[PDB]
Amino acid sequence: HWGYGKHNGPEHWHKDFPIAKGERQSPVDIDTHTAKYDPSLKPLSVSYDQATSLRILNNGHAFNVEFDDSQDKAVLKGGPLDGTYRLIQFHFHWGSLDGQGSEHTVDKKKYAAELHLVHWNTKYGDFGKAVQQPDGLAVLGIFLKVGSAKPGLQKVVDVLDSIKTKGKSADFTNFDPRGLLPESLDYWTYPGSLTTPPLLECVTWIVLKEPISVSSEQVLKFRKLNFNGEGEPEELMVDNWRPAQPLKNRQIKASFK
Numbered sequence: 001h002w003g004y005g006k007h008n009g010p011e012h013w014h015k016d017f018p019i020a021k022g023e024r025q026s027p028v029d030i031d032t033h034t035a036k037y038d039p040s041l042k043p044l045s046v047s048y049d050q051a052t053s054l055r056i057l058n059n060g061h062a063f064n065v066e067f068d069d070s071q072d073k074a075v076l077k078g079g080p081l082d083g084t085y086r087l088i089q090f091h092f093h094w095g096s097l098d099g100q101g102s103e104h105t106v107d108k109k110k111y112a113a114e115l116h117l118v119h120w121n122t123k124y125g126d127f128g129k130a131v132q133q134p135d136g137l138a139v140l141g142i143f144l145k146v147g148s149a150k151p152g153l154q155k156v157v158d159v160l161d162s163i164k165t166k167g168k169s170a171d172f173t174n175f176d177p178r179g180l181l182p183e184s185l186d187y188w189t190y191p192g193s194l195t196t197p198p199l200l201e202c203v204t205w206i207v208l209k210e211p212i213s214v215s216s217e218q219v220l221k222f223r224k225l226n227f228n229g230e231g232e233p234e235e236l237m238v239d240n241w242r243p244a245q246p247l248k249n250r251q252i253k254a255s256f257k
């Protein structure tokens, strides 16, 4: 099925998922001179004090750090959102070199990677229901640039050796995702979609202006993961990002003046 190579990569996804050419696809380029400050944006509330991480999984496209979302522990509220969105997993998209890797771009600039903290709207009762609704998910997107190490990421990069190939997983309890946030919570927001098949148009995107810094050694370890399963020909998990899609009739709003 789909992937990131020449033969199954983003330019092909529309054949099995025609919504690939829809009216609210993600990611997009964020044109900093067109995005308008919206003084009506309520403030953002990231409540991760009670987050319970459970497991890390290589799913053959990225790795997901998964949380217990059986109850309202780690939630995202406020900003452009109505109601309460539960954290279910985070993952990253990254490149083969530092010059590309992010999905969103800023004035066409690609970052070395992008973190997605995925949350679902609890008024829909479960995640599978939430993905069918235009306000079903809220994805908090954080850019990564390469420079000084991020101390809160090191537990993640140290476990990657044990989930090298697709379908491998490891116990990953007690990880605190607050250690992946930047200082400022200033953000851009627009209505969009999942950036992997089935590309459902169910996401409120909230993309932080301030990137986090990670080290070269840190991102080099992301790039040693494999897209393939155990014992199959090795295909390094790199460039697992979808390029920017047409903005169409959408407004990107800024939380900051």
Ligand SMILES: NS(=O)(=O)c1ccc(C(=O)NCC(F)(F)C(F)(F)C(F)(F)C(F)(F)C(F)(F)F)cc1
Pocket (backbone or CB within 6 Å): 116, 118, 127, 128, 131, 139, 193, 194, 195, 196, 197, 198, 200
């Ligand atoms: N990169 S991103 O934008 O942050 C991003 C975030 C999360 C997902 C994600 O949960 N895909 C998984 C998925 F939702 F597609 C899903 F398989 F779980 C699903 F529920 F849709 C379903 F396919 F099961 C469906 F249709 F309901 F049957 C994808 C992209």
Ligand SMILES: [Zn+2]
Pocket (backbone or CB within 6 Å): 091, 092, 093, 116, 195
């Ligand atoms: Zn993602």
